[PDB]
Amino acid sequence: AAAKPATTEGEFPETREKMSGIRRAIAKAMVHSKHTAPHVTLMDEADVTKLVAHRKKFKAIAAEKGIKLTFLPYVVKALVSALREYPVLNTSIDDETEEIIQKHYYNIGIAADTDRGLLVPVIKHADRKPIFALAQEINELAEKARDGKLTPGEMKGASCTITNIGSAGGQWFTPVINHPEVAILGIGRIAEKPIVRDGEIVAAPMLALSLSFDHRMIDGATAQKALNHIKRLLSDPELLLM
Amino acid sequence: AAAKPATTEGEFPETREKMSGIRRAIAKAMVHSKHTAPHVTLMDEADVTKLVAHRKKFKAIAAEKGIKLTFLPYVVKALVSALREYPVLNTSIDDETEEIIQKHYYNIGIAADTDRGLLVPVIKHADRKPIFALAQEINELAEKARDGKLTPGEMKGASCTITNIGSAGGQWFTPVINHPEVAILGIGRIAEKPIVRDGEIVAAPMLALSLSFDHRMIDGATAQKALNHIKRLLSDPELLLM
Amino acid sequence: AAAKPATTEGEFPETREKMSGIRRAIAKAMVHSKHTAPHVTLMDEADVTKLVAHRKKFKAIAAEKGIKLTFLPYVVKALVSALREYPVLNTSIDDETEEIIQKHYYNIGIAADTDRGLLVPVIKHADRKPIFALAQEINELAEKARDGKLTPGEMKGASCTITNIGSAGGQWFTPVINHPEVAILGIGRIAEKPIVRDGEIVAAPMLALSLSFDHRMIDGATAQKALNHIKRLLSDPELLLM
Amino acid sequence: AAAKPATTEGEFPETREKMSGIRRAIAKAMVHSKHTAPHVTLMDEADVTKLVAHRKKFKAIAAEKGIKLTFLPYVVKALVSALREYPVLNTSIDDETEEIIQKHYYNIGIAADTDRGLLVPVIKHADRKPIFALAQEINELAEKARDGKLTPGEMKGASCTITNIGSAGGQWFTPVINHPEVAILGIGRIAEKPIVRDGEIVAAPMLALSLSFDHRMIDGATAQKALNHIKRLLSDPELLLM
């Protein structure tokens, strides 16, 4: 394929230059990922009226354990159980392009935007860990990321990832899969949105969930069901206990 | 990479053919652009209840200067100042793929769909021009585009672009960056949408803003912040004066 | 011409003496300026009921950027755009006294009364700068002035000047042009003044604006229009966006 | 005396040049006038509540004679009779600087801002002419001025002048005397201003009247009385009949 023709940018305005090492590694990674994978994003909104209420009530138990209860640890779980139900989400394309490596363990990573670039620390076996233990690790791996203390070993073997950026802003996005993975879970800003109760309209905060999928593996229907079930697992987190 | 296998379309129905010169140049350009750049679009809605009110009040001063106050000149500005604040949006990848050429001048272009194809006339130094002067130029470059009187010099050196198509229709889109640029600003139809005022729901026209970004440069967080700030600059255009 | 006859001031009372270096430079400058230029001042009051309301609302965004939103940065702009509209204000008399040098860039300076004298720091390209950036520079150049850290390079190439002294007092004044410039913008105290709304009288704060002009260039009508338009640009700062 | 030091204006911005013939003649005239005459302006406001009412009622008789009744012809008269009363206003300094040439005829001129410059057409014997005849001549000499059809003979022998610019704007100004004359009558915008009727405040349109005077002839008291009497002649134009 052909690229962008060189343009003498000094002809119109003034210029300056330079990048960094990590940004170049991310650049190349995102080049290979979008050149080797069929992309399409699914947009689904989950009713998070009860979850936000839960997160605010458990604020006392959080501080007692020295943790900050965010929306992140709850999401890591809602996916953790949904992944067990749909193994086609925790797989990868074999190099022979004719098979599917079904991972039995689920190590979910989360994007952490630092000064040097993007760092996705992986949480090993998030299925065997409660919100407090998960949040503790999310906060630890996030602080080590900003300080550049993250060992390369904590950046490997991730089944799926989550690009939580609800703290920043936006409504919908189209995240790109960090291969050899097959799916990424994007999440935007929360907003009290009007929802019909079969009779009248009622305000209810909704979470934006944009997930990308590799269609060489995950089709259209199977990818949507996953998100629809994530909606149900979020509205009633008690369905995770079940 | 492999392409589309030739299909004998004359076997099922009847057929006809032919294209034009400009459409072929646009085709090839959009081929290189999507083959050399990591794409993901960000969807953000800005409260434009006060802006629409402003645009309608200044209709008298517009006609006196022989100009039509559209939503275009206001957007060119809201981005113009937002670009100054976030220089990573007005840059480009060096051919050495290891640096960033930071443009100090901001020449924004806008897509103009003609009969022969797509033409993106560039407005030089839109940062040093008021709405009337900008609109005057937007209308001039647009009329010259439809008449094919646009010199090739006015189609060069653009920092960013805007694919305004709110006059046509739609809600959300996923525009593609006209490289070597790093970002494009898409805008859809306006619609009185329900927005909660912390107590009750209220009608308020919102502008659809879909922006594509090159992730080799612009990450997820930095791209969203840009759009969130564009939201704030649109809701209160007085923040541009500031 | 003849001067003041020497008077033995020691005959009536007691006396003391001495001046400073900067005051002598200002003295001589104001001697040449009033000996080579036709002077007449124009008094115009602008409705600043909405601007004062704006300046007070943006106090939160000001402190976040570490700036003090004064009436100065708003004035620098209202003139900045008015200057673009009327180029005869940003000119100067050629040494051949038969031409007019039309400056295309507008570098406005402001009088800063220090202990050693009068210092007029120039803000380069105030047309390409927002209120926050302008105020930041106004505060910086003002502090450097009082500390005597102002380099002589920042005291050159000014198109027009502003002698803001509203913080002190007074109603009207007759400032003198700092040549080779052609105009100076004086501003006095604000005061809630009675203004008829076609039916009844209503209180509304007004800004005193006294501008001097060189009549070898600027006539009576052209000078007034400038001030009348400055009135309109101040009452509705949204006309600057336009 | 010393002048303005040459400044290389090309060092900071870009430049352009050139003037015209008439503007140079006005420039030189205003140089000599302010270098040979002691200047001080007197600001006086006249109650024009009844005059404006008169001018609006006689609109029918005006159109019948093909004339536009402005505030100009009424002012030419109010001064015309006031000049007869105070001959020190219609004089001039003899070249011997020891006498006063008392003109017995009063030929008042009015400033007319054209494209080429300032033109002051003189109305001969305005004391022997009614408002209709005066207005007819004011309109005729004004149209000939804009068309450059004014013979140099109509620009000579003026006792006093009037720089009416109320149509443009402003509040107060400091006009400069067109020597060998001794006084000029400036007039600004009209505005319904609050005036106490010994009990309560009442709205009443006032005319701004700024007159410059040569103090080698006209002192402070004699100059003010003239303006105070002009106030009285304007409030009640029937005092001109008397």
Residue entry with tokens 């060992």: A151
CB-based contact, C204 to chain D, within 8 Å: no
3-state secondary structure of A5: coil
Q: Per the structure block, which two tokens stand in for D164?
A: 């009416």
Measured between alpha carbons, how far is residue C60 from residues B242, C52, C68, D52 in Å?
A: 12, 15, 10, 49
Of the candidates C1, C38, C107, which has its C-beta nearest D34's C-beta? C38
Contact D27 C217 (CB under 8 A): yes
Contact D171 C44 (CB under 8 A): yes
Task: Please state the φ and ψ torsions of residue B34, each to the nearest 5 degrees.
Answer: -90, -5
Give the C-alpha separation, C70 to C78, whole Å: 14
Inter-chain contacts counted by CB atoms under 8 A, chains C and D: 140
Four-residue CA torsion sign, B230, B232, B237, B242:
negative
3-state secondary structure of B44: strand
SS (H, E, C) chain C: CCCCCCCCCCCCCCCCCCCCHHHHHHHHHHHHHHHCCCCCEEEEEEECHHHHHHHHHCHHHHHHCCCCCCCHHHHHHHHHHHHHHCHHHCCCECCCCCCECCCCCCCEEECEECCCCEECCEECCHHHCCHHHHHHHHHHHHHHHHCCCCCHHHHCCCCCEEEECCCCCCCCCCCCCCCCCCEEEEECCCEEEEEECCCCEEEEEEEEEEEEECCCCCCHHHHHHHHHHHHHHHHCCHHHHC
Give the C-alpha separation, D46 to A81, whole Å: 88
Which one, of D45, D55, D26, lies nearest residue D188 by Cα? D45
Give the chain C residue whose CA is nearest to the CA of D174.
C40
Q: Per the structure block, which two tokens stand in for B230?
A: 């564009």
Shortest distance between the Cα of C242 and any Cα of chain D, in A, equals 22
Contact D174 C39 (CB under 8 A): yes
- Please name the amino acid found at residue C31: V
Burial B16-53 (b: 16+ CB within 10 A, else e): eeeeeeeeeebeebeeebeebbbbbbbbbbbbbeebee
Give the chain C residue whose CA is nearest to the CA of B82.
C130
Resolution of this PDB entry, in A?
A: 4.4
| Residues in B touching A2 (Cβ below 8 Å) | 31-32, 35-36
Measured between alpha carbons, how far is residue A171 from residues A43, A45, B41 in Å?
A: 10, 10, 11
Peptide bond just before C180 cis, omega within 30 deg: yes
Which one, of B180, B185, B186, B148, lies nearest residue B166 by Cα? B186
* Cβ partners under 8 Å of residue D41, min gap 6: D173, D174, D175, D186, D210, D211, D212, D213
CB A171 within 8 A of CB A208: yes
Give the C-alpha separation, D48 to D188, whole Å: 13
- Give the A window 92-111 contacts with B, CB below 8 Å: 111
CB C222 within 8 A of CB D113: yes
Catalytically active residues of A are 215
CB B39 within 8 A of CB A9: no
Contact C157 D9 (CB under 8 A): yes
Q: How was this structure determined?
A: X-ray
Measured between alpha carbons, how far is residue A169 from residues A53, A166, B226 in Å?
A: 21, 5, 9
Give the C-alpha separation, B146 to B43, whole Å: 30
CB-based contact, C171 to chain D, within 8 Å: no
| Residues in C touching B74 (Cβ below 8 Å) | 241
Peptide bond just before B180 cis, omega within 30 deg: yes
Which one, of C210, C242, C233, C228, lies nearest residue C74 by Cα? C233
Q: Do C and D make contact, counting contact as 3+ CB pairs within 8 angstroms?
A: yes
Of the candidates C61, C69, C130, which has its C-beta nearest B81's C-beta? C130
| Residues in C touching D8 (Cβ below 8 Å) | none
**DSSP per residue over A202-218, as a string?**
EEEEEEEEEEEE-TTTS
Tell me which of A171, A196, A200 to substitute to probe the interface with B (most B C-beta atoms closer than 10 Å).
A171
- Please name the amino acid found at residue B123: I
3-state secondary structure of D113: strand
> How many C-beta neighbours within 10 Å does residue B104 have?
12
CB-based contact, C142 to chain B, within 8 Å: no
Peptide bond just before A130 cis, omega within 30 deg: no
Q: What chains are in contact with B, requiring at least 3 Cβ pairs below 8 Å?
A: A, C
CB A15 within 8 A of CB A9: yes
Which stretches within chain A are classed as H helix?
A: 21-35, 49-57, 59-64, 72-85, 131-146, 220-235, 238-241
| Residues in C touching D26 (Cβ below 8 Å) | 215-216, 219
CB C62 within 8 A of CB C69: yes
Q: Per the structure block, which two tokens stand in for A108?
A: 């979910």
Query: What is the DSSP pairing of strand C183-187 with strand C161-164?
Result: parallel
Give the chain C residue whose CA is nearest to the CA of D191.
C196
Q: What chains are in contact with A, requiring at least 3 Cβ pairs below 8 Å?
A: B
CB B74 within 8 A of CB B51: yes
Contact D26 C215 (CB under 8 A): yes
SS (H, E, C) D133-153: HHHHHHHHHHHHHHCCCCCHH
Shortest distance between the Cα of C179 and any Cα of chain D, in A, equals 7
Which one, of C146, C118, C115, C121, lies nearest residue C134 by Cα? C121
Tell me which of B80, B215, B218, B227 to substitute to probe the interface with A (most A C-beta atoms closer than 10 Å).
B215
Q: Per the structure block, which two tokens stand in for B84?
A: 């100054």
Which one, of B156, B153, B170, B194, lies nearest residue B49 by Cα? B194
Give the C-alpha separation, B194 to B171, whole Å: 15
Q: Per the structure block, which two tokens stand in for C116?
A: 């050693």
> How many C-beta neighbours within 10 Å does residue A166 have?
18
Contact D118 C174 (CB under 8 A): no
| Residues in C touching D173 (Cβ below 8 Å) | 40-43, 220, 224
| Residues in B touching C77 (Cβ below 8 Å) | 241
Which stretches within chain B are classed as H helix?
A: 21-35, 49-57, 59-64, 72-85, 131-146, 220-235, 238-241
Burial class of residue A242 in the structure, from the number of CB atoms within 10 Å of its CB (0-12 exposed, 13-18 middle, 19+ buried): exposed
CB D141 within 8 A of CB D111: no
Query: What is the DSSP pairing of strand A191-196 with strand A183-187?
Result: unpaired
Which one, of B1, B35, B45, lies nearest residue B214 by Cα? B35
CB-based contact, A15 to chain B, within 8 Å: yes
